[PDB]
Design a protein around this ligand. Structure first.
Ligand SMILES: Nc1ncnc2c1ncn2[C@@H]1O[C@H](COP(=O)(O)OP(=O)(O)O)[C@@H](O)[C@H]1O
Ligand SMILES: Nc1ncnc2c1ncn2[C@@H]1O[C@H](COP(=O)(O)OP(=O)(O)O)[C@@H](O)[C@H]1O
Length: 203
C-alpha cells in the first residue's frame, strides 16, 4: 500500500504520518525531514536546497525526484508526506512506481482553512534533541523541555509557503481526483479524531 498525504502546510500531515508509521509499520518518507537533515549535514543536496527552504520556495523538481529514488524502500508500505508537491513530481512518482510494479493507492487530502494553517504553523515547536513536534497551544512541550521554532515557520515565510502551496501544489487535488484515488480528511479536527479518519480511509 502506498499513501500520499496532500494538503496545506500546517494541516497535520507529518503528525499523522509519524503516528501511522509508528503504529502500523509504514515507511514514512518526509521530504521536509530528509531535506532538513541534508541542510544540517551540508551535503551537496543540502547546500543547494537550503536557500529555497529558507525562503519558503519549493526545491527544484529534479533534486526532489532524485531524492525520492534514493530513499524509496525495496519493500514495505509507504507514506509519502510532503511529496509530490508539483504536477511534474506527481508524474515522476507514477512513472517510478509503475517500474516497480506499484502505484499510489490513496491520496489523503488534509483540508484546513488558512486561519487554522497560520495558527498551527505559528505555534509549531521542535525538540532539537529528538525531533518531536509540539504546539504551544494544542500540544505544549513538557515543563523544562527546550524547544525551537523553525525559521520557515516565521510569519512572512508561512505566507510565502501558503502562496506556493496554492499555486503549485493545489493542482494535485484535481490531478488525483481524476484518477479517482483522492480521499478527503477533515484536518481541522483534533489529532485523535483525524487519526481515526485516516485509519478508516485506508481500511
Ligand atoms: N489535528 C491537530 N490539531 C491541532 N494541532 C495539530 C493537529 N495536527 C498537528 N498539529 C500541530 O500543528 C502543527 C503542524 O502540524 P504538522 O503535522 O507539522 O503539519 P504538516 O506536516 O502538515 O505541516 C504542529 O505544531 C502540530 O503539533
Ligand atoms: N516535495 C518537495 N518538493 C520541493 N520542495 C520541498 C518538498 N518537500 C519539502 N520541500 C522543501 O522543504 C520545505 C519544508 O517542507 P515541509 O517540512 O514538507 O513543510 P511543512 O512542514 O509545511 O509540510 C518546503 O517549504 C520546501 O522548501
Amino acid at each position: 500500500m502506498i499513501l500520499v498525504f496532500l494538503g496545506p502546510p500546517g494541516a497535520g500531515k507529518g503528525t499523522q504520518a509519524k503516528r501511522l508509521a509508528k503504529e502500523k509499520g509504514f515507511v514514512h518518507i518526509s521530504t521536509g525531514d530528509i531535506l532538513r537533515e541534508a541542510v544540517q549535514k551540508g551535503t551537496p543536496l543540502g547546500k543547494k536546497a537550503k536557500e529555497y527552504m529558507e525562503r519558503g520556495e519549493l526545491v527544484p523538481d529534479d533534486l526532489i525526484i532524485a531524492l525520492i529514488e534514493e530513499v524509496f524502500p525495496k519493500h514495505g508500505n509507504v507514506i509519502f508526506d510532503g511529496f509530490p508537491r508539483t504536477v511534474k513530481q506527481a508524474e515522476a512518482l507514477d512513472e517510478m512506481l509503475e517500474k516497480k510494479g506499484l502505484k499510489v493507492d490513496h491520496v489523503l487530502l488534509f483540508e484546513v482553512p488558512d486561519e487554522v494553517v497560520i495558527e498551527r504553523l505559528s505555534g509549531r515547536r521542535i525538540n532539537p534533541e529528538t525531533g518531536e513536534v509540539y504546539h504551544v497551544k494544542y500540544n505544549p512541550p513538557p515543563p523544562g523541555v527546550k524547544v525551537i521554532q523553525r525559521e520557515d515557520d516565521k510569519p512572512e515565510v508561512i505566507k510565502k509557503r501558503l502562496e506556493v502551496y496554492r499555486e503549485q501544489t493545489a493542482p494535485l487535488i484535481e490531478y488525483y481526483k481524476k484518477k479517482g484515488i483522492l480521499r478527503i480528511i477533515d484536518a481541522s479536527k483534533p489529532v485523535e479524531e483525524v487519526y481515526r479518519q485516516v485509519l478508516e480511509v485506508i481500511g
